[PDB]
Amino acid sequence: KLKLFKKIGIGKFLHSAKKF
C-alpha cells in the first residue's frame, strides 16, 4: 500500500481558492 506520489503537487489546491 503506497500510492501518494501525486500528493506532492498540492499547488493546484491553492488554485481552487483563486477561483472562489
Curated annotation (Swiss-Prot):
Q: Where are the transmembrane segments?
A: none
Q: Which domain of life is it from?
A: Eukaryota
Disulfide partners: none
- For this entry, the protein name equals Magainin-2
Which gene is annotated as encoding this protein in its UniProt record?
Answer: magainins
Q: Which portion of the entire protein is included?
A: 83 to 94 of 303
